[PDB]
Amino acid sequence: AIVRVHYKIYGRVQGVGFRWSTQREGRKLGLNGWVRNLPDGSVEGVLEGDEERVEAMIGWLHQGPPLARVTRVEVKWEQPKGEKGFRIVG
């Protein structure tokens, strides 16, 4: 079924191609949502789509691109809202 998550990523996650790689992977996996940098140095975003696709993406988010160093992925499960496309915001 379609599900939604709000995620936060900590570590070496800005200046490492994280947003562009997240969008690339999200699209490959057939997900909608968005990703953005936060002032505290973390990355935040939303995934929305088939739960199997979301689960694969959460797996990916624990690594990110080779250059990243992800220390923690925080996940909040939410009701889908009708996200269209996967966008880099900010």
CA separation for the pair 42, 70 (Å, rounded): 10
The phi, psi pair for 7, rounded to 5°, reads -125, 155
Give the three-state DSSP class for 25.
helix
Q: What is the CATH number of the domain that holds 40?
A: 3.30.70.100
19 is annotated as an active-site residue: yes
- Tokens at 58, concatenated: 């959460």
C-beta neighbour count of 64 within 10 angstroms: 22
> Which value in Å is the resolution of this experimental model?
1.6
- Method for this entry: X-ray
d(CA 51, CA 4): 8
Q: 61: closest CA among 79, 86, 35, 85?
A: 35
State yes or no: is 32 an active-site residue. Answer: no
Of 12, 36, 37, 87, which is the active-site residue? 37
What domain range is 24 assigned to?
Answer: 1-90
CB-count exposure of residue 15 (10 Å: 0-12, 13-18, 19+): exposed
How many CB atoms lie under 10 A from the CB of residue 18? 23
Domain count for the chain, please give it. Answer: 1
Which of 4, 19, 32, 53 is catalytic? The answer is 19
